[PDB]
Amino acid sequence: ACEGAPEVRIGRKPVMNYVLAILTTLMEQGTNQVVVKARGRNINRAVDAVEIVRKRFAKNIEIKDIKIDSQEIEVQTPEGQTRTRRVSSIEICLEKAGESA
Amino acid sequence: ACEGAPEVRIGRKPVMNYVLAILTTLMEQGTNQVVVKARGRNINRAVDAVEIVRKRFAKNIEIKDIKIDSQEIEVQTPEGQTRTRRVSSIEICLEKAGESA
Numbered sequence A, B: 001a002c003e004g005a006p007e008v009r010i011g012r013k014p015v016m017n018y019v020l021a022i023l024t025t026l027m028e029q030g031t032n033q034v035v036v037k038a039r040g041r042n043i044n045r046a047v048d049a050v051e052i053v054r055k056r057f058a059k060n061i062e063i064k065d066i067k068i069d070s071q072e073i074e075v076q077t078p079e080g081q082t083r084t085r086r087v088s089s090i091e092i093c094l095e096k097a098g099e100s101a
Helices: A015-026 A042-056 B015-026 B042-056
Strands: A007-009 A035-039 A060-076 A082-098 B005-007 B031-039 B062-074 B084-097
Touching: A007 A015, A015 A035, A015 A042, A015 A082, A035 A042, A042 A060, A042 A082, A042 B042, A042 B062, A042 B084, A060 B042, A060 B062, A082 B042, B005 B015, B015 B031, B015 B042, B015 B084, B031 B042, B031 B062, B042 B084
Parallel strands: A007 A035, B005 B031
Antiparallel strands: A035 A082, A060 A082, B031 B084, B062 B084
């Protein structure tokens, strides 16, 4: 769901910055959706950012869809040994009511 | 969704223990659903546990539903000042195919 919507990826900056990006993005008249994405330890922070937004605008911003997934990352030793690890990810789509009211 | 299903709450034990609980629980003939729950920093770990399970049984265990929420926790100073903070949570319902095959 929410294919094409702009994306806010949770990085090193303070959760406060991503909340601002989410809100600023959603305040645009022609944009009613924004997806928040994160991997690994940042997943908790993605949820925090979304919950701050949800609780501030509990009446017009809904969590439309959530998906979790994981990626297999691998490296090869020079002698041909494969070493792998999985990294989890989360994607949360937030949708604002029609426009406002 | 998945009302009534048994619950695996992600705590201090190693993610490996919760994966075992999830699988052991799902291996029961009459139980096709299990909800994984976590709050705060443990949310990343809930996702990891679920992804380990999902990738090991990618063909018969599906993520049926996911919800995130947050709780307002508060304490009162003896002089009447309220101090609050929000704690995020996640609930993931895993469902196994009919029985097996």
